[PDB]
Amino acid sequence: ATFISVQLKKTSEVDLAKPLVKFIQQTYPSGGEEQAQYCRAAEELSKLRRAAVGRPLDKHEGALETLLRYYDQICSIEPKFPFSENQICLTFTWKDAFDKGSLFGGSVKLALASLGYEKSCVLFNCAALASQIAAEQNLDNDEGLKIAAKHYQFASGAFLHIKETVLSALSREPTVDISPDTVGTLSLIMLAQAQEVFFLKATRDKMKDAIIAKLANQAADYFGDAFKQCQYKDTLPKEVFPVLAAKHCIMQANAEYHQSILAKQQYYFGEEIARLQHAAELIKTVASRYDEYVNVKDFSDKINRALAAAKKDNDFIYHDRVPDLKDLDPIGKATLVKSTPVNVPISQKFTDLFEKMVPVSVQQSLAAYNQRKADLVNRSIAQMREATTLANGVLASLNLPAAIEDVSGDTVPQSILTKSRSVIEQGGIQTVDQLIKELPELLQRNREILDESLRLLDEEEATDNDLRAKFKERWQRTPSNELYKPLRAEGTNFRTVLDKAVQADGQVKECYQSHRDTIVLLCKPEPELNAAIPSANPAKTMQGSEVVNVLKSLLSNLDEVKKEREGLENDLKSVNFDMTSKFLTALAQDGVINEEALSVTELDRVYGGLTTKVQESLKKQEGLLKNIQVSHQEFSKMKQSNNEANLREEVLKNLATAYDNFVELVANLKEGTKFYNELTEILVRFQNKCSDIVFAR
Amino acid sequence: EKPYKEVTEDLLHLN
């Protein structure tokens, strides 16, 4: 009972968790529940690999399932970690199963950081182990036959799968054993042996000789093709080649022998003899040439008896001419076997440790989408603010709308009064003064954090250097200096930001001292404010004039244009679409994810009404500014230039400008403060890293 | 053009 089986590949143990957990934490919340399960999966995973590949080799279905499970799990991980770029480097080291090499030596090894390589080797071991479990089965027993058939077919499919994937899975050339041609040959050997098992079942079940001859002939055809492949390319262990040659002949003989019984039953006595002679010749050759590998004594006796009996009857009774072999018809062929497809899960009762984990492809698309969503939202918002800023600057330069509200040059025009009261309510000048005052204190807070952080590093390093200098033998560690270069690289960037923040401060400060006085005036109680605003004569051309009403409507509309910008900006910021589903659908429905066309399409649907309206604001303002510009210069002819009115106009213009300045200043300062406050949160984290690292030392 | 624009951008980059 000699069946071919394949030996398991050897691999060196590697740390599975490490590069996995490293990535895990990089991509999730510290202490966050992710780690809680994911890191616990990557742990159980490494133990699996060791169990599936480190263990001494056990021909136990339990041991085979563990290997199958490991192939399943390993496959289930590919989408959920960024192996492709390979910045994620975990290296897999396997040895050739057969100690085969293109160059002359004993054994050839190969370490690759390609999960594709790992996958092929695991599957190979799955195939090889299955082939060993099959070769051990008791074939005089129905269960043994079922088990042997199933495993040989599994092995056949696994090997063939390896053949079809191996090269795409690998950058460089494979070790021989898993090379496409080696695994193609093994695949066919496994299939032949499965066909053999069905021939034995057929025999044991005493099926018709017609069937048995066809099953056996199909086996012959399988073993014969495998033989041919091996005939000029010796990449399998030494006993494989002779065994194939033997099994090819034995299966041919079986086919002849059963076909001869059929001939006999049809009174084709000459054919019967010719076929039994072919069978005797085949089995005779096997007995002497491959006795090292097979035992055909019982079969040889059986043939011999059938031939002697047949020659007797023919020589005395039938007198039938014995045909030449070339004149006989082919025995047909019937296959009952198929290479089993590898579709994970190939293990029983599988459960993907990382099923919850989100496919890398989708996160790459979610991140991408957000860089697009930010750009859309920020862009439109900035477009709107710059436009509003531009128009306020234009209206002030024209004394609008003050000029139209100033019917009596005696009193504070209503729009100035509204603005005054608005500012006073917002705290007045105190508001600005306070923000300005503590700007330098927020800077100082941050410098201090940064400085203390770097001092930690400096101090420890200082003792590290001393210790190495005095205790060379006893103090041998990577020098703190080396270890700290990364954190000090952060340090220098932080420092670069702070240098810029200082400049941003100096700019806002200078701009604040350049407008403080006029803002102080704006904030006076109304009578005191009126008293400081030079009076002038009015002109009745104010009451009912056309230019005034035209200008007023233009101004009212422009006002509606800028008040609308508030709701638009807020609607821009308050909405969002979670794109996870859209990406997962694309990925399950399809093989790949193209976010660009997807992002664009969803963005357009979520933000398109708004982005459109924003664009209308801008063009609408444009129209308005040209119109008021022309209408004013006309309104200008109407009014009269004297030093009194000139002086009033200068103060009104300056008062409107002071309102806009107060608005901008408060906003630029609160943006400054937020920056310093957020920078403190980051510097506090940075300071912890420095503490941690100085104390792990 | 806003004094803290660039500095605010540098911050996100890191945070």
Coordinates of C-alpha atoms in Angstrom, one line a residue, chain A residues 156-547:
Chain A
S156 CA -5.1 18.4 -5.1
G157 CA -7.2 21.7 -5.0
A158 CA -4.9 23.4 -2.5
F159 CA -1.8 22.6 -4.5
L160 CA -3.5 23.8 -7.7
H161 CA -4.6 27.0 -6.0
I162 CA -1.0 27.6 -5.0
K163 CA -0.1 27.1 -8.6
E164 CA -2.6 29.7 -9.8
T165 CA -1.8 32.4 -7.2
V166 CA 1.9 31.9 -6.1
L167 CA 3.6 34.3 -8.5
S168 CA 1.3 37.3 -8.1
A169 CA 1.6 36.7 -4.3
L170 CA 5.4 36.9 -4.6
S171 CA 7.7 39.7 -5.9
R172 CA 10.6 37.4 -6.4
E173 CA 10.9 33.7 -7.6
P174 CA 9.5 31.0 -5.3
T175 CA 11.4 28.2 -3.6
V176 CA 11.0 25.1 -5.8
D177 CA 8.4 23.3 -3.8
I178 CA 5.8 26.1 -4.2
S179 CA 6.8 26.9 -7.7
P180 CA 3.9 26.7 -10.2
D181 CA 5.2 23.5 -11.9
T182 CA 6.0 21.6 -8.8
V183 CA 2.6 22.3 -7.3
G184 CA 0.9 21.5 -10.6
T185 CA 2.5 18.1 -10.6
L186 CA 1.7 17.4 -7.0
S187 CA -1.9 18.5 -7.7
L188 CA -2.2 15.8 -10.3
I189 CA -0.5 13.2 -8.2
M190 CA -3.1 13.9 -5.5
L191 CA -6.0 13.7 -8.0
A192 CA -4.7 10.4 -9.5
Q193 CA -4.5 9.0 -6.0
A194 CA -8.1 10.1 -5.3
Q195 CA -9.1 8.3 -8.5
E196 CA -7.2 5.3 -7.2
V197 CA -9.3 5.3 -4.0
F198 CA -12.5 5.3 -6.0
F199 CA -11.2 2.4 -8.1
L200 CA -10.6 0.5 -4.8
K201 CA -14.1 1.4 -3.5
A202 CA -15.5 0.2 -6.8
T203 CA -13.5 -3.0 -6.4
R204 CA -14.5 -3.5 -2.8
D205 CA -18.2 -2.9 -3.7
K206 CA -17.9 -5.6 -6.5
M207 CA -19.1 -3.2 -9.2
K208 CA -19.3 -4.3 -12.8
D209 CA -15.9 -4.9 -14.5
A210 CA -16.8 -2.4 -17.2
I211 CA -16.9 0.3 -14.6
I212 CA -13.9 -0.9 -12.8
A213 CA -11.9 -1.0 -16.0
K214 CA -12.8 2.6 -16.8
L215 CA -12.1 3.9 -13.3
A216 CA -8.7 2.2 -13.4
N217 CA -7.9 3.5 -16.8
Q218 CA -8.7 7.1 -15.7
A219 CA -6.3 6.6 -12.8
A220 CA -3.7 5.4 -15.3
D221 CA -4.1 8.5 -17.4
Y222 CA -3.7 10.7 -14.3
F223 CA -0.6 8.9 -13.0
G224 CA 0.8 8.7 -16.6
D225 CA 0.5 12.5 -17.1
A226 CA 2.1 13.1 -13.7
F227 CA 4.9 10.7 -14.7
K228 CA 5.5 12.6 -18.0
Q229 CA 5.7 16.0 -16.1
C230 CA 8.3 14.5 -13.8
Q231 CA 10.2 12.8 -16.6
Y232 CA 12.3 15.8 -17.5
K233 CA 12.4 18.0 -14.4
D234 CA 13.4 16.4 -11.1
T235 CA 12.0 18.6 -8.4
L236 CA 10.2 16.1 -6.1
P237 CA 11.7 13.7 -3.6
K238 CA 13.5 10.7 -5.0
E239 CA 10.9 8.0 -4.4
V240 CA 8.1 9.9 -6.1
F241 CA 9.3 9.2 -9.7
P242 CA 9.6 5.4 -9.4
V243 CA 6.3 5.2 -7.5
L244 CA 4.4 7.1 -10.2
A245 CA 5.9 4.8 -12.9
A246 CA 4.8 1.7 -10.9
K247 CA 1.3 3.1 -10.2
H248 CA 0.9 4.0 -13.9
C249 CA 1.6 0.4 -14.8
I250 CA -0.4 -1.2 -12.1
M251 CA -3.5 0.9 -13.0
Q252 CA -3.0 0.0 -16.7
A253 CA -2.8 -3.6 -15.8
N254 CA -5.9 -3.4 -13.6
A255 CA -7.7 -1.8 -16.5
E256 CA -6.7 -4.6 -18.9
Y257 CA -7.5 -7.3 -16.4
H258 CA -11.1 -6.0 -15.9
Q259 CA -11.6 -5.3 -19.5
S260 CA -10.5 -8.9 -20.3
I261 CA -13.3 -10.3 -18.0
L262 CA -15.6 -8.3 -20.2
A263 CA -14.2 -9.7 -23.3
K264 CA -14.6 -13.2 -21.9
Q265 CA -18.2 -12.5 -21.1
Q266 CA -18.8 -11.6 -24.7
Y267 CA -17.0 -14.7 -26.1
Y268 CA -14.1 -12.6 -27.3
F269 CA -11.7 -15.2 -26.1
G270 CA -8.8 -13.9 -28.2
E271 CA -9.1 -10.4 -26.8
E272 CA -9.4 -11.8 -23.3
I273 CA -6.0 -13.4 -23.7
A274 CA -4.3 -10.5 -25.4
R275 CA -5.4 -8.2 -22.6
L276 CA -4.4 -10.6 -19.8
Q277 CA -1.0 -10.9 -21.5
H278 CA -0.6 -7.1 -21.6
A279 CA -1.5 -7.1 -17.9
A280 CA 1.0 -9.9 -17.1
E281 CA 3.8 -8.1 -18.9
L282 CA 3.0 -4.8 -17.1
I283 CA 2.9 -6.5 -13.7
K284 CA 6.0 -8.5 -14.4
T285 CA 7.9 -5.4 -15.2
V286 CA 6.7 -3.7 -12.0
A287 CA 7.6 -6.7 -9.8
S288 CA 11.2 -6.7 -10.8
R289 CA 11.9 -3.1 -11.4
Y290 CA 10.0 -1.5 -8.5
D291 CA 9.8 -4.2 -5.9
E292 CA 11.5 -1.6 -3.7
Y293 CA 8.2 0.3 -3.8
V294 CA 5.2 -1.9 -4.4
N295 CA 3.9 -5.4 -3.9
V296 CA 1.9 -6.9 -6.8
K297 CA 2.2 -10.7 -6.0
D298 CA -1.5 -11.3 -5.4
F299 CA -2.5 -9.4 -8.5
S300 CA 0.2 -11.3 -10.5
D301 CA -1.1 -14.7 -9.3
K302 CA -4.7 -13.7 -10.2
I303 CA -3.7 -12.6 -13.7
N304 CA -1.6 -15.7 -14.2
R305 CA -4.5 -18.0 -13.3
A306 CA -6.9 -16.1 -15.6
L307 CA -4.5 -16.4 -18.4
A308 CA -3.7 -20.1 -18.0
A309 CA -7.4 -20.9 -17.7
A310 CA -8.1 -18.8 -20.7
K311 CA -5.3 -20.3 -22.8
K312 CA -6.5 -23.8 -21.9
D313 CA -10.1 -23.3 -23.1
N314 CA -8.9 -21.5 -26.2
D315 CA -6.3 -23.9 -27.2
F316 CA -8.6 -26.9 -26.9
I317 CA -12.1 -25.6 -27.3
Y318 CA -12.6 -22.1 -28.8
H319 CA -9.6 -21.8 -31.1
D320 CA -10.0 -18.0 -31.2
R321 CA -7.2 -15.9 -32.8
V322 CA -5.4 -13.6 -30.4
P323 CA -5.4 -10.0 -31.7
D324 CA -2.4 -7.7 -31.7
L325 CA -2.7 -5.0 -29.0
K326 CA -2.7 -2.1 -31.5
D327 CA -5.8 -3.6 -33.0
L328 CA -7.8 -3.5 -29.8
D329 CA -10.2 -0.5 -29.0
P330 CA -9.2 1.9 -26.3
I331 CA -10.6 1.2 -22.8
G332 CA -12.7 4.2 -21.9
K333 CA -12.2 6.5 -18.9
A334 CA -14.4 7.6 -16.1
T335 CA -13.4 10.2 -13.5
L336 CA -15.1 10.5 -10.1
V337 CA -12.8 13.1 -8.7
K338 CA -12.2 16.9 -8.8
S339 CA -9.6 19.3 -7.4
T340 CA -11.4 20.9 -4.4
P341 CA -11.6 24.7 -4.8
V342 CA -10.0 26.8 -2.0
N343 CA -12.7 29.2 -0.8
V344 CA -12.1 30.4 2.7
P345 CA -13.2 29.5 5.2
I346 CA -11.6 26.1 4.6
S347 CA -11.6 25.5 8.4
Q348 CA -14.6 24.2 10.3
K349 CA -16.6 26.7 12.4
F350 CA -14.5 29.7 11.4
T351 CA -14.7 33.1 13.1
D352 CA -12.6 36.1 12.0
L353 CA -10.8 37.5 15.0
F354 CA -10.8 40.9 13.3
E355 CA -14.2 40.8 11.7
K356 CA -15.0 44.2 13.2
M357 CA -11.8 45.8 12.1
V358 CA -12.3 48.3 9.2
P359 CA -10.8 47.6 5.8
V360 CA -7.7 49.8 5.2
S361 CA -9.0 50.6 1.7
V362 CA -12.1 52.3 3.2
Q363 CA -10.2 54.3 5.8
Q364 CA -7.9 55.6 3.0
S365 CA -11.1 56.7 1.2
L366 CA -12.7 58.2 4.4
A367 CA -9.6 60.2 5.1
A368 CA -9.4 61.3 1.4
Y369 CA -13.1 62.3 1.5
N370 CA -12.5 64.6 4.5
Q371 CA -9.6 66.4 2.9
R372 CA -12.1 67.0 0.1
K373 CA -14.9 68.0 2.5
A374 CA -12.6 70.5 4.4
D375 CA -11.5 72.1 1.2
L376 CA -15.1 72.6 0.0
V377 CA -16.2 74.0 3.3
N378 CA -13.2 76.1 4.2
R379 CA -13.0 77.4 0.6
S380 CA -16.6 78.5 0.4
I381 CA -16.5 80.0 3.9
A382 CA -13.3 82.0 3.2
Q383 CA -14.7 83.2 -0.1
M384 CA -17.7 84.6 1.9
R385 CA -15.8 86.3 4.7
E386 CA -13.3 87.9 2.3
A387 CA -16.3 89.2 0.3
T388 CA -18.0 90.6 3.4
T389 CA -14.8 92.2 4.5
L390 CA -14.4 93.7 1.0
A391 CA -17.9 95.2 1.0
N392 CA -17.7 96.7 4.5
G393 CA -14.4 98.3 3.5
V394 CA -16.1 99.8 0.4
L395 CA -19.2 101.1 2.3
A396 CA -17.0 102.8 4.8
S397 CA -14.8 104.4 2.2
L398 CA -18.1 105.9 0.9
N399 CA -19.6 106.9 4.2
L400 CA -22.4 104.5 3.7
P401 CA -24.9 104.0 4.9
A402 CA -24.2 106.9 7.3
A403 CA -24.5 109.6 4.6
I404 CA -28.1 108.6 3.9
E405 CA -29.2 108.4 7.5
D406 CA -27.7 111.8 8.4
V407 CA -30.6 114.1 7.6
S408 CA -29.6 116.4 10.4
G409 CA -25.9 116.8 10.9
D410 CA -26.7 117.3 14.5
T411 CA -27.0 113.7 15.8
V412 CA -25.5 110.2 15.6
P413 CA -26.7 108.5 12.5
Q414 CA -28.7 105.4 13.3
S415 CA -26.3 102.8 11.8
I416 CA -23.5 104.3 13.8
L417 CA -25.6 104.1 16.9
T418 CA -26.6 100.5 16.2
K419 CA -22.9 99.7 15.8
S420 CA -21.9 101.6 18.9
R421 CA -24.4 99.7 21.0
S422 CA -23.5 96.4 19.5
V423 CA -19.8 96.9 20.5
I424 CA -20.7 98.2 24.0
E425 CA -22.8 95.1 24.5
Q426 CA -19.9 92.9 23.4
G427 CA -18.0 94.4 26.4
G428 CA -16.6 97.4 24.6
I429 CA -12.9 98.1 24.5
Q430 CA -12.3 96.0 27.6
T431 CA -13.0 92.9 25.5
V432 CA -10.2 93.7 23.1
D433 CA -7.8 95.0 25.9
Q434 CA -8.2 91.8 27.9
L435 CA -7.6 89.4 25.0
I436 CA -4.5 91.5 24.0
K437 CA -3.2 91.5 27.6
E438 CA -3.2 87.7 28.1
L439 CA -1.9 86.9 24.6
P440 CA 1.7 87.1 26.0
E441 CA 0.7 85.0 28.9
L442 CA -0.6 82.2 26.7
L443 CA 2.6 82.4 24.7
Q444 CA 4.7 82.1 28.0
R445 CA 2.6 79.2 29.2
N446 CA 3.5 77.3 26.0
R447 CA 7.2 78.2 25.9
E448 CA 7.4 77.0 29.4
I449 CA 5.8 73.6 28.7
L450 CA 8.1 73.2 25.7
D451 CA 11.1 74.2 27.7
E452 CA 10.4 71.9 30.6
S453 CA 9.8 69.1 28.2
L454 CA 13.2 69.5 26.5
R455 CA 15.0 70.0 29.9
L456 CA 13.8 66.6 31.0
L457 CA 15.5 65.1 27.9
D458 CA 18.7 67.2 28.5
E459 CA 19.0 66.3 32.2
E460 CA 18.6 62.5 31.8
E461 CA 20.9 62.5 28.8
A462 CA 23.5 64.3 30.9
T463 CA 23.6 61.6 33.5
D464 CA 23.4 58.9 30.7
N465 CA 26.6 60.3 29.2
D466 CA 28.3 60.4 32.6
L467 CA 27.3 56.8 33.4
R468 CA 28.7 55.5 30.1
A469 CA 31.9 57.5 30.6
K470 CA 32.5 56.0 34.1
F471 CA 31.0 52.5 33.7
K472 CA 31.8 51.5 30.1
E473 CA 31.3 47.8 30.9
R474 CA 28.3 48.3 33.2
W475 CA 26.5 51.0 31.3
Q476 CA 26.0 49.7 27.8
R477 CA 22.7 51.0 26.4
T478 CA 21.8 52.9 23.3
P479 CA 22.8 56.5 24.2
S480 CA 20.0 58.8 25.3
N481 CA 21.3 61.2 22.7
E482 CA 20.3 58.7 19.9
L483 CA 17.0 57.7 21.4
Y484 CA 15.9 61.4 21.9
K485 CA 16.5 62.7 18.4
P486 CA 12.9 62.1 17.3
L487 CA 11.3 64.0 20.3
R488 CA 13.9 66.8 19.8
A489 CA 12.8 67.0 16.2
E490 CA 9.3 67.6 17.4
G491 CA 10.7 70.1 19.9
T492 CA 12.3 72.1 17.0
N493 CA 9.0 72.2 15.1
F494 CA 7.0 73.3 18.1
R495 CA 9.6 76.0 18.5
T496 CA 9.2 77.0 14.8
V497 CA 5.4 77.4 15.3
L498 CA 5.9 79.5 18.5
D499 CA 8.3 81.8 16.6
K500 CA 5.5 82.4 14.0
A501 CA 2.8 82.9 16.7
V502 CA 4.9 85.7 18.2
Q503 CA 4.8 87.4 14.8
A504 CA 1.1 86.9 14.4
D505 CA 0.8 88.6 17.9
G506 CA 3.0 91.6 17.0
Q507 CA 0.8 92.1 13.9
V508 CA -2.5 92.0 15.8
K509 CA -1.0 94.2 18.6
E510 CA 0.2 96.9 16.2
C511 CA -3.2 96.8 14.4
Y512 CA -5.0 97.1 17.8
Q513 CA -3.0 100.1 19.0
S514 CA -3.6 101.7 15.6
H515 CA -7.4 101.5 16.1
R516 CA -7.9 101.6 19.9
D517 CA -8.7 105.4 20.1
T518 CA -11.5 105.4 17.5
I519 CA -13.0 102.3 19.0
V520 CA -12.9 104.0 22.5
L521 CA -14.9 106.8 21.0
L522 CA -17.4 104.4 19.3
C523 CA -18.2 103.0 22.8
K524 CA -19.1 106.3 24.4
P525 CA -22.7 106.8 25.8
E526 CA -24.7 108.3 23.0
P527 CA -24.7 112.0 24.2
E528 CA -20.9 112.1 24.8
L529 CA -20.4 110.3 21.5
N530 CA -22.6 112.8 19.7
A531 CA -20.7 115.7 21.3
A532 CA -17.4 114.4 19.9
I533 CA -18.9 114.2 16.4
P534 CA -18.5 117.5 14.5
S535 CA -21.8 118.9 13.3
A536 CA -22.6 120.3 9.8
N537 CA -25.5 121.7 7.8
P538 CA -28.0 119.3 6.3
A539 CA -29.5 119.4 2.8
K540 CA -33.2 118.8 2.1
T541 CA -32.1 116.9 -1.0
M542 CA -32.1 114.1 1.6
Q543 CA -35.9 114.1 1.9
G544 CA -37.3 112.1 -1.0
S545 CA -34.5 112.4 -3.5
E546 CA -34.2 109.6 -6.1
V547 CA -30.5 108.7 -5.7

